[PDB]
Amino acid sequence: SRRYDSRTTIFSPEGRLYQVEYAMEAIGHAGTCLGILANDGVLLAAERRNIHKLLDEVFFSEKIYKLNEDMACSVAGITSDANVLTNELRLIAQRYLLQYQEPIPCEQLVTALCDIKQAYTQFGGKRPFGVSLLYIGWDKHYGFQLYQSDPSGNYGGWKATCIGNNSAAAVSMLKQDYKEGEMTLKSALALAIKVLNKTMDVSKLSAEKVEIATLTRENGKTVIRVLKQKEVEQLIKKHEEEEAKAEREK
Amino acid sequence: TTIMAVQFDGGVVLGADSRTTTGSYIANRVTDKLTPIHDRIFCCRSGSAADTQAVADAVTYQLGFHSIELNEPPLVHTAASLFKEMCYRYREDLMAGIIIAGWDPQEGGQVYSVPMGGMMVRQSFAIGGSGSSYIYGYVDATYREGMTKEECLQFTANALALAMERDGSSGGVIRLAAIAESGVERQVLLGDQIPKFAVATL
Amino acid sequence: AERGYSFSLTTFSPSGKLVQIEYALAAVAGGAPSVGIKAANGVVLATEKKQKSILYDERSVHKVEPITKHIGLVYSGMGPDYRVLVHRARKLAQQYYLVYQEPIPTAQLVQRVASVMQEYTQSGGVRPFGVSLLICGWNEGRPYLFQSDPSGAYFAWKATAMGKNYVNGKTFLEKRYNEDLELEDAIHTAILTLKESFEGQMTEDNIEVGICNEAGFRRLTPTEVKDYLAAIA
């Protein structure tokens, strides 16, 4: 028994948890995914990996999840593992709603799911979940917010960030082309197709090789929607059909 | 109810009425109160129908496994023990008055009584159920040692007939069954077949 | 006296891969092939039941199993693992009905069973299921076809294949057929995509097929099978 146990929750001589780091690896190979924060909205854009001419796909999305009524999120990693952490996310939301009769503060729904992943790394002898998530939503405390979580049970709020493939080239890009304080859901969707066109081994980044969803206020009730095929391409062409116009300036 | 069992040389005779009431309403005037526990072992039931049925199925299950496991005909004493164990253990939650009679390749014909308390005792012949109170004197003055599968089979027929006559909680048809090495034969006594006794007149 | 292993038997390697899951899929890729087609007007499942070792009684066991009155299954991989999942799906199907009084929506049954399969990739003392399933159903007008594999991940297909030559069996369908295919049509293009690898004399006992139209799910008899076989019916 002692012989077959891999010790998934032990410290390494360095002082790090190797099973967490290996989960990361798996993440940095999954469909790219990112979200940017505006002032009138917040969004999520992900590299639709279930791209193939035979799938019948009958869902609102493939990597976009509705949690709260004021929240939604996206994942990067093991999908099954993700279906588990989201389901639990929905439950934590409702338990809060039952108990307080008010939508759960965005960050709080995150610290919640994080304490669970953190646990899977301190005890139990189980492997952590191979998932990293992006959370976007609105709450009467900080309105629009974007959050990111690691299988380490770690998180942070980002004005803009990315997860998944080339989740490095995506950062630095936004890290400089981001309007820190002057973003519109439009100027946001801007970098969206711009950065996804980059970090995504795809030429002319087709409408399918992507999934978009945006969250905004609107006369009280929060609104969550995933752009329709057409609505997508508008930003597809807009990007390029403006890029060739950008080289007529050089 | 009125149940009864008698031991004769190579076997046993078992009798019971067919009445099962709830208050003063007969919910079944044709009940079968003689339940097969194993190939040659039977039990008569009196008390809570639900309790006696539930207990009997349990013993049948217990005994069937025991015999296959031993690859041998089960003892009558064993079957009695399994009833006694459940009836003693759950005596506060059961209302069962049971008689176990059957044939044993090792002990022959036998009859055991397992009344309310959960006690178990072997007897030449046993009687149970509400109606039994009206046939003690009868049964005590009539029982003869050395009766035949016929005398016995007739002896219980009279006792059950008498008891059914006086007890409101007993009546219907008289069911019988004789068990001996050869096997088990069950018969029924409808209307006229039921012994009769003239109601005293002027 | 038995205890239990509480540590998970599946763990990330440095490559970030979940080794046991890949290997599970390998058991799948090595199993009798299966095809599923969503005929926009129903769905068909068929697999290679090549047992009949002259002594095997093809009847006694099936690979195309009914979950509910309107759901159905087939697999590719380890038979015994399948059986376990069949009993759990059927069970999950009832726990839904008792609560809601409405037959379980095919997508929902898939999600539930997928969760189970995922469970066996993290819980202690166990190995992932060495199987992949193709669930078909008629829930609310539209026909559905899904596949969930060892990882516990699932997808909806218009049609596909799993098992031996699933690579070729897919590409074949990747063109050898398309939507709008009516009932009996999708059935033919399915038994055909099967033969595209079925080594031997593909008879009515070498295969088994089930269909799911918006009027219940069922298995086709050796008769209706022997028929479609003659390159028609």
Place this chain on the structure above:
Amino acid sequence: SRGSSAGFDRHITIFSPEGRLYQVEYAFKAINQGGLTSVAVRGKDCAVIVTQKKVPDKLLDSSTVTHLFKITENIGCVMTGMTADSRSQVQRARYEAANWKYKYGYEIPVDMLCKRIADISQVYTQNAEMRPLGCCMILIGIDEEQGPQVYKCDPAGYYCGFKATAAGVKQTESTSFLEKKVKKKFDWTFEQTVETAITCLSTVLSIDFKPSEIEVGVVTVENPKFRILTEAEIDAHLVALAER
């Protein structure tokens, strides 16, 4: 792949790079360890169980030496492989069967019993704490409207019904024999079914055994109760095969 190994895929029931379970396989070889072979055949009006009865010692009450077990009165079986494991599995079968009737009201179908025992073994195949059982089980009896049934379950979880089958050392030789005689298949009567079974075992073991060297179990549509042939009447079949 191609016989590769990684980690403990050879010590506990976990997948190998190929997607195999060596422990389940090692479990099959374990069956042959007993050095015995068993055959079962399905007649049109009955089912037959036949196995070796190697009793090299005169100090054993040959009576206590068997591989033929009465599960129910209408269900009989033959075990092949590691003994203790076998008795165990037999006891579980007896249990699952007695329980089925108590809980449902009717004798368990030979079909179901085997599927049950099978499902159980499947766990040992997915759980690492314990090893699979190194034994094989063949059950036979008459169904309500399906007549005689013959089923066998694996130390791997597989189970199935057959016209006839075998297990043990000469399982693969016994199948080739039977499947060849099931084509020429005359009228599968009680005598032929019994006769065909004996020879299959005698020729694959090339023995022409005495009446004490084998044991025969049978269930009949006219006598559904499982029956184990006497040494006497076993010979009655042996002599009958010698008339030619």
Place this chain on the structure above:
Amino acid sequence: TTIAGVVYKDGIVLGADTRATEGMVVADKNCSKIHFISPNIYCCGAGTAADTDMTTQLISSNLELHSLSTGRLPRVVTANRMLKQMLFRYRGYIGAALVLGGVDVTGPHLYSIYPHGSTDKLPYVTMGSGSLAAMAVFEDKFRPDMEEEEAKNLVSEAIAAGIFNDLGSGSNIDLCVISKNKLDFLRPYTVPNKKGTRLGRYRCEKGTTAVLTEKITPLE
């Protein structure tokens, strides 16, 4: 409630009134009391409505799971067993009085199960507050091997006896016939009760109701 069943030549017939009461007031003029177990097995329920529902639904559900594995068709003894062993286990707290009937490979079977868990195997049975009334019909006019129609009406006659003679029973008479090859679930089978024809007019004309607050909301 009045529920009954009879065993005839080709199968079984189940009856049942349709009244449901909350105390001495009629809550439902049309309750469905004959429940579906398996395609060849049906059960009438009397007692605590909710209990009669859930127990009946559970055994059904468990039998669909059962035959879904055996591949055969459910037997009556099985429904009887499952039901009785559960009820017994709850020592009478699950107030379900059942009339179970169906056709087996072994034939048509009619069982009566009480809330405490005992059962009766009989050619004809009744349960519910109207059971004594119904049982009278049977005891007076019962014959073995009746023809479908000769039974199909003996049962509607006993469910009728209940309906009129027991304040706990009323409304319609539902039926269920199950034979070796047929299953006629005759919902309204008879309807000997009609609401008296309204002799006046009371239709509330728009505007008669003084309002204190209004608020609309458009859908899509």
Place this chain on the structure above:
Amino acid sequence: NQYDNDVTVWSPQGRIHQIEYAMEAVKQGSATVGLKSKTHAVLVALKRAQSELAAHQKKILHVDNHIGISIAGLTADARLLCNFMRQECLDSRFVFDRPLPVSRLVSLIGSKTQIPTQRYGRRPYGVGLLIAGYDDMGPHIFQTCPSANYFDCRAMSIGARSQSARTYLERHMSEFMECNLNELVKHGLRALRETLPAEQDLTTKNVSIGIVGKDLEFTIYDDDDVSPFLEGLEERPQ
């Protein structure tokens, strides 16, 4: 070494090293001796001191009025077993109002200490025991080892260099049964002395004696109390 760390692992030779290793714990402990006449059971033991400023270790413990023991091996395990032994005795008196038959108590130690030798993750008790008691079957001297095995003895000794003591006891057995107490104790003290380096012997500081018998409840003697027995020694073979 694949067969050395778990008591659930048999070696290809039909041995269980963990058990053997635990037995080694006994050998390390200082030697102790036990012997009985036909009316008395006697325990004798040599106590060790870590440094000169520390006291000598207890080696003899009182179990019940008719039972006492001497220990060798892990002290913590001795206390566990002693307390089990004490508890078992208290129970006997409580339920039956009679002292627990020494042989029956020994069977319980046997059963109790066997369990852990067969379960994964568990370890054998690391202590040997000499048990001196007196029941309605007379005096008794038992021995119990890390392997759940136990022995009924005429006389015995476990510990470091206990081989000498055993040898001395084996030579004067026939004498024991008829010895009167003080003589019996001397044979004990004498045997113990056998296990020592020639350039040293029994001190009233390192000897402990335990006596139980038809005429006396188990009693222990430790310092000045040991003098009376040390007086009238023997030359001590030079």
Place this chain on the structure above:
Amino acid sequence: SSIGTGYDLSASTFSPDGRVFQVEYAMKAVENSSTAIGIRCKDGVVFGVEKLVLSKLYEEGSNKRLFNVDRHVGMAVAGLLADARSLADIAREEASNFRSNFGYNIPLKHLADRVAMYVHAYTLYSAVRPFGCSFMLGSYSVNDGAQLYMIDPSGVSYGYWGCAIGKARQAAKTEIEKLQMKEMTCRDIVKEVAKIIYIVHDEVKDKAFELELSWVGELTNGRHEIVPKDIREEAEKYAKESLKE
């Protein structure tokens, strides 16, 4: 055959060739033990054991390898004594529970199948190790006659007319086959048991020894008892004298 590359550390692991080395290893422990034999006479079962003299300091009766598992059942053991003793408690408990439940003395075949399944339970997991012992169960009754069973570390159980376990399992058998127990009476078998013991016992290697004899048959009235000192001595003399030939 030297198989053992991890394949011999857990009872929950099969060797590449279908073996459970832990169980096999447990049996070796038994093969290294001193010989014990059982023989079914016509009116009972007789037990004899070569209980080696561990030390002259030990009492006669120490380390008994024969116990009463029930008043009508005897148990003869070989191998790791502590393991055997716990198996003796299980046997006792099993026989006691049976009486409490079914209300009559347990049939030797059942007590044997039961204990055997308990033994077997310990050969499937890594959580525990197989018993390093083998034992025989002997009983007599008029409705069952004489019965002799033997269970080993794997759980296997069988009925015998004569049987031996230990150092000289083989040597003891070839000597038992010389007797025609089926027709022999228990009172005469004692002699033969003690005889086969001295023959088989290795005068060289194994030093001095003691003889343990168990009783059970019509001669004991169904109660398994120790053989009376008187019979033992006679049987010892007969064995020693027959040795000088």
Place this chain on the structure above:
Amino acid sequence: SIMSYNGGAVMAMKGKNCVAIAADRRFGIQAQLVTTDFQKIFPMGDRLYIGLAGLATDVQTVAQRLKFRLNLYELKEGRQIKPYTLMSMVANLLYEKRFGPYYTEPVIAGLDPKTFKPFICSLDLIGCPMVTDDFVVSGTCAEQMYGMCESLWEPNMDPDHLFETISQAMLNAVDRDAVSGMGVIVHIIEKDKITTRTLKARMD
């Protein structure tokens, strides 16, 4: 009795392609009024409302716990609960407390989310459901309410002749019940709109 501790009345009616549901507004403890604005009808999706009568605490609790379940159901399923299904959902939640039930007998009123189908039903405090094509009542004046209903309900009714009908049933029944009243509220649901009016009633 426990049920009449807070008093209260609830009713649902079936029109042609519309549905109505009304409830008194009093929240009292025995004889004493405590509040006049007590919600007893809760929105469980558009075109679907549930009305809870009975013990105040369980009214609130059964509703809150039901929402909990309704929301997740809608997040897992990719839809909006169908009336017959919400009824079965409440039937399950109540019966899970079979031997220590919530003291409330619910009333469900709504239109099919993907159809015209008007739907109404009521339940047992232990979850037994009842579906009808006319009306359903619950509360401390079941009898009064049945009185009106069996004399004012007509098979088919336009939204306005339904509103005027259910509004009369309430106000008049509730006015012959001492612990029900303090105002009535009505909800009329049409495929297109939701009309919500608080009728003019007695305040004693």
